[PDB]
Design a binder for this molecule. Structure first.
Ligand SMILES: O=C(Nc1nccs1)c1cccc(CN2C(=O)N(Cc3cccc(C(=O)Nc4nccs4)c3)[C@H](Cc3ccccc3)[C@H](O)[C@@H](O)[C@H]2Cc2ccccc2)c1
Lengths: 99, 99
């Protein structure tokens, strides 16, 4: 799709059998999701944002379908205000920025 | 131009006679820059990000050049780690997201 930026660029994702919506976020290196039951192993990590750092759990090799596109990668789950999809998954669905 | 997201999408901007680099950030509503000196009047605002909230100063009607394109808008100056251009300016240079 081509999405213009007059509104939040929100998309539907299915992760773990749950459907959420999320923001396509070009400035975020990593994908961070709000608290959610994911099965499996995870490693604690911290990321920074504006505002500070947050401790998060990192899940590797998780399948996500973002607007119907499947991709697999790392997601971080933690106290974000909003589900953000960052460049690690954006490259996989082929997402580009044009001006 | 077209920008793929394998690297952080930085552009050069010129603002208040100064050159900086900034990140193009579709997940950000507002543009927020590191502290620098801008002329004029401002007012306090408080912005939330991942990690928390920060207080910033709002300058309205600032001229920025982002790549070779000019825009005039609100700019927030404050304690970010990284200069972020948000959708309020991104819309003015006609930036789209495509997948
Ligand atoms: O990978 C990451 N970090 C890592 N650390 C180590 C390794 S990887 C990472 C992953 C996701 C997000 C971020 C951190 N992050 C944010 O904090 N903001 C808040 C933001 C930025 C700019 C403006 C606003 C804004 O307008 N906010 C408003 N609040 C009220 C009104 S408007 C908000 C949003 C996301 C957001 C929007 C709304 C609510 C909550 C969050 C941006 O869209 C993101 O790209 C990014 C920008 C950034 C990148 C690096 C360092 C600092 C800041 C970093």
């Amino acid at each position: 799709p081509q999405v213009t930026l007059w509104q939040r660029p929100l998309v539907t994702i299915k992760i773990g059998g749950q459907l959420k919506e999320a923001l396509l976020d070009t400035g975020a290196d990593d994908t961070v999701l709000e608290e959610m039951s994911l099965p499996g192993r995870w490693k604690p990590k911290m990321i920074g944002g504006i505002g500070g750092f947050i401790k998060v759990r990192q899940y590797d090799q998780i399948l996500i379908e973002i607007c119907g596109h499947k991709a697999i990668g790392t997601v971080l789950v933690g106290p974000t205000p909003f589900n953000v999809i960052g460049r690690n998954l954006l490259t996989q669905i082929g997402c580009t920025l044009n001006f």
